[PDB]
Amino acid sequence: RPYACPVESCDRRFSRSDELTRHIRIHTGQKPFQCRICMRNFSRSDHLTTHIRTHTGEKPFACDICGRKFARSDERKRHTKIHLR
DNA sequence: AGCGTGGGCGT
DNA sequence: TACGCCCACGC
Ligand SMILES: [Zn+2]
Ligand SMILES: [Zn+2]
Ligand SMILES: [Zn+2]
């Protein structure tokens, strides 16, 4: 991990330079992406994409066992587990 | 439950 | 450099 965060209070290191640039945003407070609907700003594009689903009601991921739908894959993953117990 | 949000990393 | 995934933690 050749890329260390320069903020003295922080000590995060990364493998690629782009990971450092993305991380740096938590320190600069920069949020490049804005929701066309509610105007809220976000630090990342992928998080804006999933956030928008809260407005549209879009749920692309369904449970293979019960068919319950979710807006995010990690929500589906957390849910499928319950069918074990 | 619903969802913000950082980290890793393939491409 | 950027997108967009999985992943995971936190409330
Ligand atoms: Zn930092
Ligand atoms: Zn919004
Ligand atoms: Zn299910």
Side-chain angles (χ1 to χ4, degrees), chain A residues 37-67:
Chain A
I37 295 80
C38 70
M39 303 308 268
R40 180 179 183 160
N41 308 98
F42 298 86
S43 57
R44 291 159 50 159
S45 64
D46 58 326
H47 291 339
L48 169 63
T49 294
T50 62
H51 159 76
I52 290 180
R53 292 186 186 135
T54 70
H55 293 302
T56 57
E58 170 182 320
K59 295 174 174 175
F61 312 91
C63 174
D64 286 337
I65 293 169
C66 70

mmCIF file of all heavy atoms in Angstrom, chain A residues 37-67:
data_model
loop_
_atom_site.group_PDB
_atom_site.id
_atom_site.type_symbol
_atom_site.label_atom_id
_atom_site.label_comp_id
_atom_site.label_asym_id
_atom_site.label_seq_id
_atom_site.Cartn_x
_atom_site.Cartn_y
_atom_site.Cartn_z
ATOM 1 N N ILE A 37 -33.630 14.107 -8.199
ATOM 2 C CA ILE A 37 -34.908 14.206 -7.505
ATOM 3 C C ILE A 37 -34.934 15.037 -6.227
ATOM 4 O O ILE A 37 -35.663 16.018 -6.161
ATOM 5 C CB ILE A 37 -35.558 12.812 -7.250
ATOM 6 C CG1 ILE A 37 -35.920 12.137 -8.580
ATOM 7 C CG2 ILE A 37 -36.830 12.962 -6.418
ATOM 8 C CD1 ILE A 37 -34.768 11.479 -9.272
ATOM 9 N N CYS A 38 -34.156 14.660 -5.218
ATOM 10 C CA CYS A 38 -34.165 15.397 -3.956
ATOM 11 C C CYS A 38 -33.049 16.429 -3.786
ATOM 12 O O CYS A 38 -33.017 17.141 -2.778
ATOM 13 C CB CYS A 38 -34.127 14.430 -2.776
ATOM 14 S SG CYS A 38 -32.537 13.590 -2.614
ATOM 15 N N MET A 39 -32.141 16.504 -4.756
ATOM 16 C CA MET A 39 -31.019 17.451 -4.724
ATOM 17 C C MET A 39 -29.898 17.140 -3.725
ATOM 18 O O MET A 39 -28.943 17.906 -3.612
ATOM 19 C CB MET A 39 -31.517 18.890 -4.521
ATOM 20 C CG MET A 39 -32.515 19.344 -5.577
ATOM 21 S SD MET A 39 -31.885 19.065 -7.244
ATOM 22 C CE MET A 39 -31.106 20.637 -7.536
ATOM 23 N N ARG A 40 -29.989 16.018 -3.016
ATOM 24 C CA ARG A 40 -28.942 15.657 -2.067
ATOM 25 C C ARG A 40 -27.688 15.256 -2.830
ATOM 26 O O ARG A 40 -27.773 14.633 -3.888
ATOM 27 C CB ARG A 40 -29.394 14.506 -1.169
ATOM 28 C CG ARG A 40 -28.348 14.070 -0.148
ATOM 29 C CD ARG A 40 -28.877 12.943 0.736
ATOM 30 N NE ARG A 40 -27.925 12.545 1.773
ATOM 31 C CZ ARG A 40 -28.267 11.882 2.872
ATOM 32 N NH1 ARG A 40 -29.532 11.542 3.071
ATOM 33 N NH2 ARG A 40 -27.356 11.593 3.790
ATOM 34 N N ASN A 41 -26.527 15.607 -2.281
ATOM 35 C CA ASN A 41 -25.246 15.300 -2.908
ATOM 36 C C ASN A 41 -24.603 14.058 -2.302
ATOM 37 O O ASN A 41 -24.801 13.757 -1.129
ATOM 38 C CB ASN A 41 -24.307 16.501 -2.800
ATOM 39 C CG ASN A 41 -24.946 17.778 -3.313
ATOM 40 O OD1 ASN A 41 -25.455 18.586 -2.533
ATOM 41 N ND2 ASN A 41 -24.956 17.950 -4.628
ATOM 42 N N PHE A 42 -23.813 13.359 -3.112
ATOM 43 C CA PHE A 42 -23.159 12.132 -2.687
ATOM 44 C C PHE A 42 -21.699 12.112 -3.113
ATOM 45 O O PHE A 42 -21.323 12.687 -4.147
ATOM 46 C CB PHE A 42 -23.881 10.917 -3.285
ATOM 47 C CG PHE A 42 -25.302 10.777 -2.835
ATOM 48 C CD1 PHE A 42 -26.325 11.447 -3.500
ATOM 49 C CD2 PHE A 42 -25.618 10.004 -1.721
ATOM 50 C CE1 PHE A 42 -27.651 11.357 -3.059
ATOM 51 C CE2 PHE A 42 -26.943 9.904 -1.268
ATOM 52 C CZ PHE A 42 -27.959 10.585 -1.939
ATOM 53 N N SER A 43 -20.892 11.402 -2.330
ATOM 54 C CA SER A 43 -19.464 11.279 -2.592
ATOM 55 C C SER A 43 -19.164 10.344 -3.749
ATOM 56 O O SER A 43 -18.125 10.477 -4.401
ATOM 57 C CB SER A 43 -18.731 10.780 -1.332
ATOM 58 O OG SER A 43 -19.229 9.532 -0.855
ATOM 59 N N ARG A 44 -20.081 9.415 -4.017
ATOM 60 C CA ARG A 44 -19.867 8.429 -5.066
ATOM 61 C C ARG A 44 -21.048 8.195 -6.006
ATOM 62 O O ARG A 44 -22.201 8.346 -5.615
ATOM 63 C CB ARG A 44 -19.439 7.108 -4.424
ATOM 64 C CG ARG A 44 -18.048 7.139 -3.801
ATOM 65 C CD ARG A 44 -17.863 6.035 -2.767
ATOM 66 N NE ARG A 44 -18.259 4.714 -3.257
ATOM 67 C CZ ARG A 44 -17.835 3.574 -2.730
ATOM 68 N NH1 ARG A 44 -17.000 3.589 -1.704
ATOM 69 N NH2 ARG A 44 -18.246 2.415 -3.227
ATOM 70 N N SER A 45 -20.725 7.798 -7.240
ATOM 71 C CA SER A 45 -21.707 7.524 -8.291
ATOM 72 C C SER A 45 -22.542 6.281 -8.032
ATOM 73 O O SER A 45 -23.741 6.264 -8.312
ATOM 74 C CB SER A 45 -21.010 7.357 -9.644
ATOM 75 O OG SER A 45 -20.153 6.225 -9.627
ATOM 76 N N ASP A 46 -21.897 5.214 -7.578
ATOM 77 C CA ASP A 46 -22.626 3.980 -7.294
ATOM 78 C C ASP A 46 -23.623 4.167 -6.146
ATOM 79 O O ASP A 46 -24.728 3.622 -6.179
ATOM 80 C CB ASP A 46 -21.674 2.798 -7.042
ATOM 81 C CG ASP A 46 -20.703 3.034 -5.895
ATOM 82 O OD1 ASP A 46 -20.254 4.181 -5.663
ATOM 83 O OD2 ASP A 46 -20.360 2.035 -5.235
ATOM 84 N N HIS A 47 -23.255 4.985 -5.163
ATOM 85 C CA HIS A 47 -24.141 5.243 -4.035
ATOM 86 C C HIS A 47 -25.308 6.137 -4.470
ATOM 87 O O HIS A 47 -26.402 6.072 -3.903
ATOM 88 C CB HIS A 47 -23.365 5.846 -2.857
ATOM 89 C CG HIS A 47 -22.415 4.880 -2.208
ATOM 90 N ND1 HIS A 47 -22.546 3.512 -2.325
ATOM 91 C CD2 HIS A 47 -21.330 5.085 -1.424
ATOM 92 C CE1 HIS A 47 -21.585 2.917 -1.645
ATOM 93 N NE2 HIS A 47 -20.833 3.849 -1.089
ATOM 94 N N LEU A 48 -25.078 6.964 -5.487
ATOM 95 C CA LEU A 48 -26.147 7.812 -6.005
ATOM 96 C C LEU A 48 -27.146 6.905 -6.728
ATOM 97 O O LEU A 48 -28.358 7.061 -6.590
ATOM 98 C CB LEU A 48 -25.594 8.850 -6.987
ATOM 99 C CG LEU A 48 -26.662 9.605 -7.789
ATOM 100 C CD1 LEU A 48 -27.554 10.431 -6.864
ATOM 101 C CD2 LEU A 48 -25.991 10.493 -8.825
ATOM 102 N N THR A 49 -26.623 5.934 -7.472
ATOM 103 C CA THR A 49 -27.455 4.995 -8.218
ATOM 104 C C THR A 49 -28.408 4.223 -7.316
ATOM 105 O O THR A 49 -29.595 4.122 -7.604
ATOM 106 C CB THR A 49 -26.578 4.000 -8.994
ATOM 107 O OG1 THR A 49 -25.853 4.712 -10.002
ATOM 108 C CG2 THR A 49 -27.432 2.884 -9.637
ATOM 109 N N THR A 50 -27.893 3.703 -6.206
ATOM 110 C CA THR A 50 -28.748 2.958 -5.304
ATOM 111 C C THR A 50 -29.669 3.889 -4.525
ATOM 112 O O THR A 50 -30.818 3.556 -4.250
ATOM 113 C CB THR A 50 -27.933 2.005 -4.400
ATOM 114 O OG1 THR A 50 -27.027 2.740 -3.578
ATOM 115 C CG2 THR A 50 -27.140 1.032 -5.268
ATOM 116 N N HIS A 51 -29.199 5.099 -4.252
ATOM 117 C CA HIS A 51 -30.022 6.056 -3.541
ATOM 118 C C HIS A 51 -31.269 6.400 -4.352
ATOM 119 O O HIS A 51 -32.365 6.547 -3.791
ATOM 120 C CB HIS A 51 -29.267 7.353 -3.267
ATOM 121 C CG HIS A 51 -30.182 8.506 -2.996
ATOM 122 N ND1 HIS A 51 -30.834 8.671 -1.791
ATOM 123 C CD2 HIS A 51 -30.638 9.490 -3.808
ATOM 124 C CE1 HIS A 51 -31.653 9.701 -1.873
ATOM 125 N NE2 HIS A 51 -31.554 10.216 -3.087
ATOM 126 N N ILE A 52 -31.095 6.572 -5.659
ATOM 127 C CA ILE A 52 -32.217 6.936 -6.524
ATOM 128 C C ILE A 52 -33.367 5.945 -6.471
ATOM 129 O O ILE A 52 -34.528 6.349 -6.596
ATOM 130 C CB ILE A 52 -31.763 7.211 -7.974
ATOM 131 C CG1 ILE A 52 -30.959 8.518 -8.006
ATOM 132 C CG2 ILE A 52 -32.974 7.307 -8.914
ATOM 133 C CD1 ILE A 52 -30.457 8.907 -9.355
ATOM 134 N N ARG A 53 -33.051 4.672 -6.218
ATOM 135 C CA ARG A 53 -34.080 3.632 -6.112
ATOM 136 C C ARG A 53 -35.075 3.861 -4.970
ATOM 137 O O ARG A 53 -36.204 3.367 -5.007
ATOM 138 C CB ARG A 53 -33.442 2.263 -5.966
ATOM 139 C CG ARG A 53 -32.724 1.834 -7.217
ATOM 140 C CD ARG A 53 -32.212 0.411 -7.113
ATOM 141 N NE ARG A 53 -31.416 0.133 -8.296
ATOM 142 C CZ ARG A 53 -30.238 -0.476 -8.297
ATOM 143 N NH1 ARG A 53 -29.696 -0.912 -7.168
ATOM 144 N NH2 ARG A 53 -29.565 -0.557 -9.436
ATOM 145 N N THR A 54 -34.659 4.637 -3.973
ATOM 146 C CA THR A 54 -35.517 4.950 -2.839
ATOM 147 C C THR A 54 -36.661 5.869 -3.306
ATOM 148 O O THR A 54 -37.715 5.962 -2.657
ATOM 149 C CB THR A 54 -34.717 5.635 -1.686
ATOM 150 O OG1 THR A 54 -34.321 6.955 -2.079
ATOM 151 C CG2 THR A 54 -33.468 4.830 -1.350
ATOM 152 N N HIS A 55 -36.426 6.558 -4.421
ATOM 153 C CA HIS A 55 -37.408 7.466 -4.994
ATOM 154 C C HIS A 55 -38.316 6.749 -5.971
ATOM 155 O O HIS A 55 -39.542 6.942 -5.958
ATOM 156 C CB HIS A 55 -36.712 8.602 -5.746
ATOM 157 C CG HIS A 55 -35.941 9.528 -4.863
ATOM 158 N ND1 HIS A 55 -36.521 10.215 -3.818
ATOM 159 C CD2 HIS A 55 -34.633 9.878 -4.865
ATOM 160 C CE1 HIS A 55 -35.604 10.946 -3.211
ATOM 161 N NE2 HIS A 55 -34.450 10.760 -3.827
ATOM 162 N N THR A 56 -37.702 5.934 -6.827
ATOM 163 C CA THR A 56 -38.423 5.213 -7.872
ATOM 164 C C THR A 56 -39.144 3.953 -7.436
ATOM 165 O O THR A 56 -40.104 3.546 -8.082
ATOM 166 C CB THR A 56 -37.491 4.848 -9.040
ATOM 167 O OG1 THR A 56 -36.395 4.070 -8.549
ATOM 168 C CG2 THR A 56 -36.953 6.102 -9.707
ATOM 169 N N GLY A 57 -38.682 3.344 -6.344
ATOM 170 C CA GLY A 57 -39.297 2.117 -5.853
ATOM 171 C C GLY A 57 -38.839 0.901 -6.633
ATOM 172 O O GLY A 57 -39.445 -0.171 -6.579
ATOM 173 N N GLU A 58 -37.762 1.091 -7.385
ATOM 174 C CA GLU A 58 -37.173 0.048 -8.198
ATOM 175 C C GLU A 58 -36.429 -0.940 -7.300
ATOM 176 O O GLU A 58 -35.629 -0.537 -6.442
ATOM 177 C CB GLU A 58 -36.219 0.690 -9.193
ATOM 178 C CG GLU A 58 -35.349 -0.254 -9.969
ATOM 179 C CD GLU A 58 -34.409 0.491 -10.892
ATOM 180 O OE1 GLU A 58 -34.860 1.487 -11.498
ATOM 181 O OE2 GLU A 58 -33.228 0.100 -11.007
ATOM 182 N N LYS A 59 -36.711 -2.228 -7.496
ATOM 183 C CA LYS A 59 -36.094 -3.304 -6.718
ATOM 184 C C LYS A 59 -35.717 -4.448 -7.657
ATOM 185 O O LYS A 59 -36.478 -5.403 -7.841
ATOM 186 C CB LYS A 59 -37.062 -3.798 -5.639
ATOM 187 C CG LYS A 59 -37.379 -2.755 -4.605
ATOM 188 C CD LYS A 59 -38.435 -3.240 -3.660
ATOM 189 C CE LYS A 59 -38.636 -2.245 -2.561
ATOM 190 N NZ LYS A 59 -39.761 -2.693 -1.699
ATOM 191 N N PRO A 60 -34.514 -4.377 -8.234
ATOM 192 C CA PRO A 60 -33.967 -5.363 -9.169
ATOM 193 C C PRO A 60 -33.551 -6.732 -8.604
ATOM 194 O O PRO A 60 -33.361 -7.674 -9.375
ATOM 195 C CB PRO A 60 -32.745 -4.645 -9.747
ATOM 196 C CG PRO A 60 -32.943 -3.169 -9.372
ATOM 197 C CD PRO A 60 -33.575 -3.262 -8.038
ATOM 198 N N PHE A 61 -33.442 -6.865 -7.282
ATOM 199 C CA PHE A 61 -32.987 -8.132 -6.700
ATOM 200 C C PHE A 61 -34.041 -8.896 -5.922
ATOM 201 O O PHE A 61 -34.495 -8.449 -4.877
ATOM 202 C CB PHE A 61 -31.776 -7.885 -5.803
ATOM 203 C CG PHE A 61 -30.721 -7.039 -6.442
ATOM 204 C CD1 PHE A 61 -30.738 -5.659 -6.295
ATOM 205 C CD2 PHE A 61 -29.722 -7.620 -7.204
ATOM 206 C CE1 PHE A 61 -29.778 -4.872 -6.897
ATOM 207 C CE2 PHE A 61 -28.755 -6.838 -7.812
ATOM 208 C CZ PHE A 61 -28.784 -5.459 -7.658
ATOM 209 N N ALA A 62 -34.368 -10.091 -6.391
ATOM 210 C CA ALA A 62 -35.373 -10.905 -5.723
ATOM 211 C C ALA A 62 -34.773 -12.129 -5.054
ATOM 212 O O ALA A 62 -33.802 -12.701 -5.538
ATOM 213 C CB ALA A 62 -36.460 -11.327 -6.716
ATOM 214 N N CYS A 63 -35.367 -12.519 -3.935
ATOM 215 C CA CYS A 63 -34.930 -13.695 -3.198
ATOM 216 C C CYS A 63 -35.304 -14.930 -4.023
ATOM 217 O O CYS A 63 -36.436 -15.043 -4.477
ATOM 218 C CB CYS A 63 -35.621 -13.759 -1.829
ATOM 219 S SG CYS A 63 -35.273 -15.271 -0.902
ATOM 220 N N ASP A 64 -34.352 -15.841 -4.224
ATOM 221 C CA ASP A 64 -34.611 -17.058 -4.997
ATOM 222 C C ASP A 64 -35.623 -17.974 -4.335
ATOM 223 O O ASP A 64 -36.298 -18.747 -5.007
ATOM 224 C CB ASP A 64 -33.333 -17.863 -5.183
ATOM 225 C CG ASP A 64 -32.391 -17.259 -6.190
ATOM 226 O OD1 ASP A 64 -32.832 -16.498 -7.068
ATOM 227 O OD2 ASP A 64 -31.191 -17.587 -6.100
ATOM 228 N N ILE A 65 -35.715 -17.885 -3.014
ATOM 229 C CA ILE A 65 -36.609 -18.728 -2.245
ATOM 230 C C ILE A 65 -38.035 -18.212 -2.068
ATOM 231 O O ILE A 65 -38.997 -18.961 -2.302
ATOM 232 C CB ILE A 65 -35.950 -19.099 -0.884
ATOM 233 C CG1 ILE A 65 -34.741 -20.009 -1.150
ATOM 234 C CG2 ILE A 65 -36.939 -19.828 0.042
ATOM 235 C CD1 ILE A 65 -33.864 -20.221 0.050
ATOM 236 N N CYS A 66 -38.189 -16.937 -1.720
ATOM 237 C CA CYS A 66 -39.526 -16.401 -1.506
ATOM 238 C C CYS A 66 -39.952 -15.286 -2.465
ATOM 239 O O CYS A 66 -41.084 -14.805 -2.398
ATOM 240 C CB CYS A 66 -39.679 -15.934 -0.060
ATOM 241 S SG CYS A 66 -38.722 -14.454 0.343
ATOM 242 N N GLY A 67 -39.057 -14.883 -3.360
ATOM 243 C CA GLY A 67 -39.396 -13.839 -4.309
ATOM 244 C C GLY A 67 -39.456 -12.411 -3.780
ATOM 245 O O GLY A 67 -39.796 -11.496 -4.523
#
